[PDB]
Design an enzyme around this catalytic site. Structure first.
Site, PDB file in Angstrom:
ATOM      1  N   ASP A   1      18.557 -16.744   7.431  1.00 40.90           N
ATOM      2  CA  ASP A   1      18.401 -16.661   5.979  1.00 40.90           C
ATOM      3  C   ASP A   1      17.580 -17.828   5.427  1.00 40.90           C
ATOM      4  O   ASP A   1      18.002 -18.555   4.522  1.00 40.90           O
ATOM      5  CB  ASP A   1      19.763 -16.568   5.284  1.00 40.90           C
ATOM      6  CG  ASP A   1      20.402 -15.208   5.440  1.00 40.90           C
ATOM      7  OD1 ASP A   1      19.730 -14.269   5.930  1.00 40.90           O
ATOM      8  OD2 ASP A   1      21.575 -15.068   5.055  1.00 40.90           O
TER       9      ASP A   1
ATOM     10  N   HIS B   1      22.824 -26.710   3.523  1.00 41.05           N
ATOM     11  CA  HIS B   1      23.040 -25.821   4.651  1.00 41.05           C
ATOM     12  C   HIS B   1      22.315 -26.264   5.912  1.00 41.05           C
ATOM     13  O   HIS B   1      22.710 -25.857   7.010  1.00 41.05           O
ATOM     14  CB  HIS B   1      22.579 -24.406   4.302  1.00 41.05           C
ATOM     15  CG  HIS B   1      23.379 -23.761   3.221  1.00 41.05           C
ATOM     16  ND1 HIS B   1      24.756 -23.789   3.196  1.00 41.05           N
ATOM     17  CD2 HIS B   1      22.997 -23.074   2.121  1.00 41.05           C
ATOM     18  CE1 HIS B   1      25.189 -23.138   2.133  1.00 41.05           C
ATOM     19  NE2 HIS B   1      24.142 -22.698   1.461  1.00 41.05           N
TER      20      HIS B   1
ATOM     21  N   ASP C   1      28.345 -26.313  -5.370  1.00 42.10           N
ATOM     22  CA  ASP C   1      27.657 -25.061  -5.090  1.00 42.10           C
ATOM     23  C   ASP C   1      28.671 -24.015  -4.607  1.00 42.10           C
ATOM     24  O   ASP C   1      29.724 -24.350  -4.051  1.00 42.10           O
ATOM     25  CB  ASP C   1      26.567 -25.304  -4.039  1.00 42.10           C
ATOM     26  CG  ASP C   1      25.646 -24.115  -3.849  1.00 42.10           C
ATOM     27  OD1 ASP C   1      24.505 -24.154  -4.347  1.00 42.10           O
ATOM     28  OD2 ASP C   1      26.057 -23.142  -3.203  1.00 42.10           O
TER      29      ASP C   1
HETATM   30  N1  SS9 Z   1      21.663 -12.312  -0.080  1.00 38.99           N
HETATM   31  C1  SS9 Z   1      21.283 -13.407   0.807  1.00 38.99           C
HETATM   32  C2  SS9 Z   1      22.387 -14.412   1.122  1.00 38.99           C
HETATM   33  C3  SS9 Z   1      21.851 -15.521   2.004  1.00 38.99           C
HETATM   34  N2  SS9 Z   1      22.573 -16.755   1.709  1.00 38.99           N
HETATM   35  C4  SS9 Z   1      21.645 -17.881   1.522  1.00 38.99           C
HETATM   36  C5  SS9 Z   1      22.417 -19.087   1.047  1.00 38.99           C
HETATM   37  C6  SS9 Z   1      21.936 -19.438  -0.314  1.00 38.99           C
HETATM   38  C7  SS9 Z   1      22.678 -20.607  -0.815  1.00 38.99           C
HETATM   39  C8  SS9 Z   1      21.726 -21.654  -1.235  1.00 38.99           C
HETATM   40  S1  SS9 Z   1      22.754 -22.912  -1.964  1.00 38.99           S
HETATM   41  K     K Z   2      30.195 -25.927  -2.125  1.00 37.90           K
HETATM   42 ZN    ZN Z   3      24.541 -21.898  -2.991  1.00 35.94          ZN
END
Ligand code: SS9
Ligand code: K
Ligand code: ZN
Ligand code: K
Length: 616
Positions: A94, A137, A174
């Site tokens: 992702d 992440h 978050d």
């Molecule tokens: N629909 C796609 C979900 C993928 N998840 C990505 C994480 C995004 C968080 C950034 S803080």
């Molecule tokens: K968090």
């Molecule tokens: Zn997020």
């Protein structure tokens, strides 16, 4: 002391984007950054903040948290065409890569270190970095979830190396779990990582067993990793504030961090397609404000997620508002957390209790007005006016003959109280104030009675002293919090705490555990502070955390002139930075007294609940 707030941003970080079809990354768009800046520009907030320039992060700083092999692999993406960039991004989960993303990644990282240097060099009180891509992440040797490098991990390691810091608090609000930050400080007790996140019993991304409350850190890190999983969507303001009052804040003030860093993702706000929570953007003004008494105010907020453009900008402005010290909006409609939130909160406190003993359970542009005594002259900050009309004088005489044998200076005490309240509620010129008083019984009565007719729908009264006060708390428009010494309790509209070295740590457990949750549910229009003349090492934290209520409109009445007490209350009222604390864990007789009061009040004041309710 430091002053101002840094806003680190640069249009260059909006010049990369997804180049192919991918439903996983479509929500992460450059417009997240431009919308947030224009929202700050529109509200005049960016103009009030010191714009620190963005720099690149050197590879020696990037290697503080990433491997040479992963850096060498990312370093090669600028040379790839789009076909080669698709293949490179498939290796990770992702995340998408662009020709310019390695460049912006070094800018997002550098912008965080710039923010860290500014805050630690006392050039600013606090700051926020609007950056792209996110960080929390990304792991030592992989990109993940729109993140290339772990910007907030750099900040903490950078501040450890370059400033010899021993205690850093990272708060990740978050809606996703910052697993890269957890991994990087897992066995590290110098970086306390807190994270709430949408979990849904592991069914929500990134679907990690270690995102659960069970993971408290390994080795000597044990107890310095706190996961709070949300197992249902639709979490509200009460859920968020409950998680703060009963998990994060008790741990935070006991940790006593030397620097607070925030992974500020606003995908945890109403309207976000990814988090599906229901917290309003105003909640972030309070989340920010509740953390400012930590580390003498040194707070670096770093942007993470938040993918609803039409709502992201509102939460950013609320955060910066609180960073600049502007009054916090009143939160209405607060109550107990939902059952799933009470479940997770109850669980995380249990697992952590073996490391934070306060979680144990028994088995079943003028801001401030100062009115010192006549003849007294003190040195006040730039936002304190140091204080009587004839309209006010006729009122003091009107109340004179009807309620008070009063032949006295005292008639000037009440004349100021009336006009400082007039300027706080009606004129909106002043925000709060402090008045030194002679006699309590008459000053408390006029202050409270004149406030209810200002009008003030509800008045919170915090009184530090013994004996009864002329306050009638039956109508329910008045709640009384009394901190005394002799055991005094009856109705569910009064909170009396009869407390050694003990006290300062017990007062803090009571302020975050009992006083703040009730006050926040009560939603006062005005806080009234009173201190008897008869040792308030905590009063600065009290007067600062309580300013989240009632849009910051507080009036303090100090019986007897104390030079250093009045110096402290004015300092906290005007918005200055607050000095930290050490202390000895509270006495068992006080922890028992505290929860014996939670039992007595949590039925009416549900925000006091930190366990799932006992269903009959
Ligand atoms: N629909 C796609 C979900 C993928 N998840 C990505 C994480 C995004 C968080 C950034 S803080
Ligand atoms: K968090
Ligand atoms: Zn997020
Ligand atoms: K840790």
């Amino acid at each position: 002391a430091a002053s101002g707030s840094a806003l680190i941003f640069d249009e260059e970080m909006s010049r990369y984007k997804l180049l192919w079809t991918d439903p996983a990354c479509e929500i992460e768009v450059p417009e997240r950054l431009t919308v947030s800046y224009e929202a700050l520009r529109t509200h005049g907030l960016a103009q009030r903040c010191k714009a620190v320039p963005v720099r690149q992060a050197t590879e020696q700083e990037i290697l503080l948290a990433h491997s040479e092999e992963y850096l060498e692999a990312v370093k090669q993406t600028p040379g790839m065409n789009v076909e080669e960039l698709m293949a490179f991004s498939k290796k990770y989960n992702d995340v998408y890569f662009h020709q310019n993303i390695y460049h912006c990644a070094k800018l997002a990282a550098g912008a965080t270190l710039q923010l860290v240097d500014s805050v630690m060099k006392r050039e600013v009180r606090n700051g926020m970095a609007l950056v792209r891509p996110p960080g929390h992440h990304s792991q030592r040797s992989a990109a993940n979830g729109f993140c290339v490098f772990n910007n907030v991990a750099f900040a903490a390691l950078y501040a450890k190396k370059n400033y010899n810091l021993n205690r850093i608090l990272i708060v990740d609000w978050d809606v996703h779990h910052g697993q890269g930050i957890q991994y990087c400080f897992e066995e590290d007790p110098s970086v306390l990582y807190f994270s709430w996140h949408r979990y849904e019993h592991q069914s929500f991304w990134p679907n990690l067993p270690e995102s659960d409350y069970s993971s408290v850190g390994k080795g000597k890190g044990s107890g310095f990793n706190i996961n709070l999983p949300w197992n249902k969507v639709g979490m509200t303001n009460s859920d968020y504030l409950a998680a703060f009052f009963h998990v994060l804040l008790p741990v935070a003030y006991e940790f006593d961090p030397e620097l607070v860093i925030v992974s500020a993702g606003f995908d945890s706000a109403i309207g976000d397609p990814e988090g599906e929570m229901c917290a309003l953007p105003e909640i972030f003004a309070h989340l920010t404000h509740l953390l400012m008494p930590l580390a003498a105010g040194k707070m670096c907020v770093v942007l993470e997620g938040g993918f609803n453009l039409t709502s992201l900008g509102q939460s950013v402005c609320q955060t910066v508002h609180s960073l600049l010290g502007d009054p916090t909006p009143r939160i209405s409609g607060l109550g107990t957390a939902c059952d799933s939130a009470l479940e997770s909160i109850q669980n995380v406190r249990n697992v952590q209790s073996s490391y934070w003993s306060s979680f144990k359970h028994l088995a079943q542009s003028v801001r401030t007005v100062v009115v010192p005594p006549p003849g007294v002259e003190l040195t006040l900050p730039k936002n304190c006016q140091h204080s009587i009309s004839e309209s006010t004088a006729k009122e003091v005489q009107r109340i004179r003959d009807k309620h008070f044998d009063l032949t006295d200076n005292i008639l000037r005490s009440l004349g100021n109280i009336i006009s400082v309240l007039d300027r706080m509620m009606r004129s909106d010129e002043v925000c709060n104030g402090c008045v030194v008083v002679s006699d309590l019984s008459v000053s408390v009565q006029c202050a409270l009675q004149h406030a209810l007719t200002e009008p003030a729908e509800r008045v919170l009264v915090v009184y530090v002293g013994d004996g009864e006060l002329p306050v009638k708390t039956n109508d329910g428009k008045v709640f009384l919090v009394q901190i005394c010494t002799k055991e005094t309790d009856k109705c569910v509209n009064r909170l009396t705490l009869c407390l050694g070295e003990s006290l300062t740590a017990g007062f803090m457990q009571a302020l975050l555990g009992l006083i703040l949750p009730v006050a926040y549910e009560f939603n006062p229009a005005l806080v009234l502070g009173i201190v008897e003349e008869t040792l308030m090492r905590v009063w600065g934290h009290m007067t600062c955390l309580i300013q989240g209520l009632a849009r910051g409109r507080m009036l303090t009445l100090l019986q007897g002139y104390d030079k250093d007490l009045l110096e402290l209350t004015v300092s906290a009222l005007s918005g200055a930075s607050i000095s930290p604390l050490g202390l000895r864990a509270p006495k068992p007789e006080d922890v028992e007294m505290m929860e014996k009061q939670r039992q007595r009040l949590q039925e009416r004041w549900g925000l006091l609940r930190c366990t799932v309710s006992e269903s009959w």
